[PDB]
From Swiss-Prot, chain D:
The protein, known as: Fumarate hydratase class II
CDD domains per record: Fumarase_classII
Origin species: Mycobacterium tuberculosis (strain ATCC 25618 / H37Rv)
Additional free-text comment from the UniProt record: There are 2 substrate-binding sites: the catalytic A site, and the non-catalytic B site that may play a role in the transfer of substrate or product between the active site and the solvent. Alternatively, the B site may bind allosteric effectors.
Reaction(s) the record says it catalyses: (S)-malate = fumarate + H2O
Residues annotated as site: Important for catalytic activity: E308
Residues involved in substrate binding: S90, G91, T92, H114, P115, N116, D117, S124, S125, N126, T172, K301, V302, N303
GO terms for biological process, alphabetical: fumarate metabolic process; tricarboxylic acid cycle
PANTHER family linked: ASPARTATEAMMONIA/ARGININOSUCCINATE/ADENYLOSUCCINATE LYASE, FUMARATE HYDRATASE CLASS II
Name of the gene this protein is made from: fumC
Keyword Nucleotidyltransferase in record: no
GO molecular function: fumarate hydratase activity
A single GO cellular-component term on record: extracellular region
Length: 449, 445, 444, 440
């Protein structure tokens, strides 16, 4: 069930299956705060970084090939998600993320030992690296991957479902609403083209932050000077990471001091996620209001059943609230760096990576299980638009503003269309024909589809 | 490996079809309810079964089976039987159904057939259950865990205020040299911030402890006994000892809004603000030693201030969670606020983080701090800020000359006065030591 | 047009060289102190002069001149004499010096020479004065203006809860059709939210009313009489009637932090959250008429312009709350240097909530009218009310009644009759008792 | 003193609808800022030009609006806009305010204008105020914020160059670390401001989108089909702001204000960067006796009043950012009704960051002086620099040197000599702190 690990202070107990060592177990017992550790994306990124560092240390003749091959093989297993249960240290740890860095070095040493290769976690696995430039690098690798490989395709899937609805509902005329009050006609297609643009603009916002989100601190070592690392370590590690992941957005930082003293790229990326959360709130709110009732609500559309409650718009608006909250935590940590190091990295990493994950997963669900299956109450929508006092204005040049206001008043009272009220009031004659009436009251033409 | 329901459910799972459908419908965060939430749902279901039995609405064999199964859930024996994502239907009905289904499967193992809705959810609705369990969990988190954790932090800071009562040092305003203070006076300030934090938590309890139970679907209590709420609350108070638990003052406000969670989050956010100031000052006091302030030494767990860093990161998380809670709080509609699982997640996490980090900070940082007493006194006695009480003896020009020479020669104000030959008829050595008494300048009680 | 100082100062200006240097140093927002902050600085200076006179530290002619000048400032007679930007030295020392110089110039017009620092700032420092005036202003804003404004809003919502006690309607959960409620019950919920809002403001007053006065530069009270703080607070409470004003429990906490403002902002933020829900429901209730819910009619000032003013004010309070907490957390050692920014935000939040709550109560809530027949018709036509028919016709026939009622756009009562269910098993009296929607709402 | 229309002040150029809005919203006692009033004047002048070009508005009427709108854009009528910021969420009241003021200016010149029929021709109550808001925000970003940030970047970069060899000890977790230069730290601050400019520039394609021509619900009903493109063309030619565009989607441009939320995010990130820069500078200037005493701030000892103004401004920008996002998310169907509140907060954030960045650059950064000898002494006395001695005296002796240096308050170099310990040239090469900082 358990095994004993030793260090200079004494002994610690670790689970039998654990690949971490005494130093990681000391960190576990030093930080019992949340009971929540690193996510799979952060763990993968630490694996990718350690493998790339071993490759570069081998290329520069600084690390023996047998040792480099063992690190590269161990780090590939971590990057493949084979050791997601080997990172037990709390998110709320030493602000540089040094404990999680040491945790990766210890797990790699234990994997290589199973294959008969002895690695020193610090001297070999952390060669040319420091306690301060490793965890922020893995954070920006994970955030860049989350943006490019997962969030942008998920948002594109949502944009395509909204755009398909904009096309399908192109002529589905309805009454507009401004200040929640009756307004001139629109189409359901036009409203959905608006939602599609919000998601398209969301993708543009994510893409615009990538030149700074993809900046890596690797090679800057303890304070950003690069002391105790080869002069080209950073450019070489980044080259290996780009070739292996296909993430061309990964780059060396423009300034090695800014890359460690601050995490401004995460604050910037969080702002884009927060704007997407704001867009999603508007889209989800309109959709659940459109599907409200049926008797006591708007009853414009029908949401797919998973009393049909709008459970996916509720999941979307709750996710948006979480992204807003995480955004405030990220900015707070971001502003409070000091001199050569910002020490809020594990907290900032947790929040940014969670915001990417929640937006990715909820956007795919919302697109597939809500948007794709929406059905419109076409006749009900057209009836309300054709019954609106807002459409009596094009009758003014035929019957006058006084008679047009009388038509509007009677239509509301008798719950009839403007067309039927004009007929019932005996206004069809030489001054206004039935064809002229239908042209003047063409609600689809008023929406200017 | 799995079983078929009228969906495929894992063989060792105690949940049934409705939970499995919720698992498939919401793969969003991959994180479900925490232990405190699961415990509160167990507490609520047991109290409801007790009241339904007391009112003769539920058969004793059925009631006993629910009470026994709910007690196991409240005891933390089934924390792996709640797989539904936090980001679910906004009323928390999925987690409510998850509890009813798990209770039905526990009772079935003991040969008692329970209908999850008709028996386990008897006199309850899909809307008054999850907010009740949320306010039970938040009230317990405040009373049983946060307040004792904050009291332990207050006591450690107050013990330091007492121990360092005469540890004179120079004050700092705008980060610049100021008149003397004691390290004890600064720590009395931190102790007051935590004491005020406890007062803030206590002040929110009359509204945090309000439970919606008995209001059913829309707050009217339709399909529940008229006294269901008062009876359930009486059972919960008797069993938990949590006297802060009460029926809501208004049953409509208790379901249409979660304002009690927004209010409680404000108190937690204020504590996070206080903890930021305390932790920042402590890591700055322990900074260096050569390039910093080197006022104190933090216990080793290069001695980095790792617990002040854990405290300030926790505070940032509490600030963030607070913004998410208020956002959800404001967006209720008509008879129901549908942001409850998200609000519950954030408020309960803020209680947990502040509880655990306050205890760690008190025990593993504050308790073991040591002051560089001689260094602190020498800097206070060398400060140009203390030349003002010399003015009435040597004039403000000569006092300014003393301040300038003391800084240049890196000497105390006392030594500079001696070195300038100012001891004489106009100023005796006893008069100088009385005028430059830095501890008396701090005016410690 | 101007006068020379040892700096060019405008001719009709009562401020002096230090204020003019501060005007030149901080051209950031173009916005100075508000009337409430100027008032509190005047109140503080007059109370300090009174205590310095009482202790024999300040000559009577000098004390009388300060007391007379400070009462003019507290009365709002010199609101155009405080030009320093909100974004100034974080202790608020510039605005403290601004008050001392304006008092000196007022006294000079009456032939009394006052030294702004030696006389007007006697027994005080650059650091315990502006936070004291801030907490005086915030306490007065809470007690004299916000709580009465919220009480007026609670009273208007409670009057509507009473008037609409029997106005039955259909409930809404997740925005979908639910069992009956009354408009009165919903408004009793809104009234409780505002009543709880008042309780929240009252609960923060023991810490909001704490004053730093007497703590001087670092909280030790050095260069002030030992009882200066208790005496100044005694004068302020006797003269203003604000009994919530008290000396700080800990003089170091009172200057190193502004946690009382962070706490008070939390209460204002919760009220903003409650007001958002109340205003959103009211504008949705008044929506349409054709394309909306058309439950009520809002008074024309028909766009819901007051609910829009309320929800925008609430957004501002949320924003100001984040700025206050940010400043609150970033104190260092003996002094929090974010006081003018924190003061600006907390006092604006008090003002906006006060003014919009009065407007909302008088010009929106008081004049609301309900579409009583429309509300009852929808409740009586809801499938949600077929459940009490189960013990007479069975849940299958009850579901068939619900389906037909929706399709034919009829009441449940009419559908039961049209389906020929009135007979020996169910009389017309038994049907009306079972489908009594007001009784289903279970109003008190 | 007052005229009847409602009682309106005699010298006021506004009319009955503005007076009713003054009476309806006594909430904050604060109206539109000069930038907002200017943008409304620019919009009305461009609309009159296009209505004249399309033959829809008589030349005498068009010339009168163009002249009156030019006076408003020039800041000649900033006292004629008394409606509270907290008004009808579309900003329709401030739109009518502009139409009424233009009508009264034209009347003084003998031209009768109908505020709605002429001044609001081809426009609605809903596409005008968001257009003026995005014009004002785009101008604030391009003409004022970016040049102010460039001024701050240039002052920080000049310090990074001047202090290129000013070696000092690094600080990580606030603890003693290996050497850096004051120039390297200032190059970091300069990059943060340079990245800040990139962040503002990246939001301009969406911040510059204007709703004009969308009318009531975004459909363009009761406006010429090319009204929007023509108005935008006139505004670009007259302001020189090539960033002003027609919206990509006319419905998104009125149902949401996502461009303001996005721009606020960039301003919030700059506030975050400025907090770090200002905090480091006031800590560097702290003491002198009880602090770090690394640099001396110019006097306006010396309190860091400009870093305090910067950190307070940053807190305000953070707060305004939360208010903007809150308003941004709560739109409904065809219109987001939080525009005046969002406009107030975004334009204030632009103004505060603009003004404080110029002050911080000119009156703080430019005049900073470094305590060069003190900084080098501490770096040369640090136990962090004993590591390059290990290959000469061993880790045990190198630790003994570090311990004795701290106790006797001496340099590592002096302690090595005092312990009788490796030539003097080899020692100076091994303990070269500037070489350890590896400056380019």
């Amino acid at each position: 069930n358990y095994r004993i690990e030793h260090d200079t202070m004494g002994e610690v107990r670790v689970p039998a299956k654990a690949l971490w060592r005494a130093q990681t177990q000391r960190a576990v017992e030093n930080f019992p705060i949340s009971g929540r550790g690193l996510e799979r994306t952060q763990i993968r990124a630490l694996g990718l970084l350690k493998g790339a560092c071993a490759q570069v240390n081998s290329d520069l003749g600084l690390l023996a090939p047998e040792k480099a091959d063992a690190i590269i093989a161990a780090a590939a297993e971590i990057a493949d998600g084979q050791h997601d249960d080997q990172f037990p240290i709390d998110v709320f740890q030493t602000g540089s993320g040094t404990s999680s860095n040491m945790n990766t070095n210890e797990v790699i040493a234990s994997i290589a030992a199973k294959g008969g290769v002895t690695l020193h976690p610090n001297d070999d696995v952390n060669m040319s690296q420091s306690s301060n430039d490793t965890f922020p690098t893995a954070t920006h690798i994970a955030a860049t991957e989350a943006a490019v490989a997962h969030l942008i395709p998920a948002l594109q899937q949502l944009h395509d479902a909204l755009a398909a609805k904009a096309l399908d509902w192109h002529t589905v005329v309805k009454s507009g609403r401004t200040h929640l009050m009756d307004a001139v006609p629109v189409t359901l297609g036009q409203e959905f083209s608006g939602y599609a643009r919000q998601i398209e603009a969301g993708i543009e916002r994510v893409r615009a932050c990538l030149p700074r989100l993809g900046e890596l601190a690797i090679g800057g070592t303890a304070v950003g000077t690069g002391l105790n690392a080869p002069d080209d370590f950073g450019v070489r590690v980044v080259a290996v990471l780009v070739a292996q992941t296909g993430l061309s957005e990964l780059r060396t930082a423009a300034n090695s001091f800014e890359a460690q003293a601050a995490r401004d790229g995460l604050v910037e990326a969080s702002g884009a996620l927060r704007t997407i959360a704001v867009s999603l709130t508007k889209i989800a709110n309109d959709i659940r209001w459109m599907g409200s009732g049926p008797l006591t609500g708007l009853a414009e559309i029908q949401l797919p059943d998973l009393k049909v409650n709008p459970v996916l718009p509720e999941a979307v608006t709750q996710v948006a609230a979480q992204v807003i909250g995480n955004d405030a935590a990220i900015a707070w940590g971001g502003a409070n760096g000091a001199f050569e190091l910002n020490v809020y990295i594990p907290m900032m990493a947790r929040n940014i990576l969670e915001s990417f994950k929640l937006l990715t997963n909820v956007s795919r669900l919302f697109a597939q299980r809500c948007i794709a299956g929406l059905t419109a109450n076409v006749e009900h929508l057209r009836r309300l638009a054709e019954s609106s006092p807002s459409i009596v204005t094009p009758l003014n040049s035929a019957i006058g503003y006084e008679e047009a206001a009388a038509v509007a008043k009677q239509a509301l009272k008798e719950r009839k269309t403007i067309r039927q009220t004009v007929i019932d009031r005996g206004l069809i004659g030489d001054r206004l024909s039935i064809e002229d009436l239908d042209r003047r009251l063409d609600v689809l033409a008023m929406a200017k589809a």
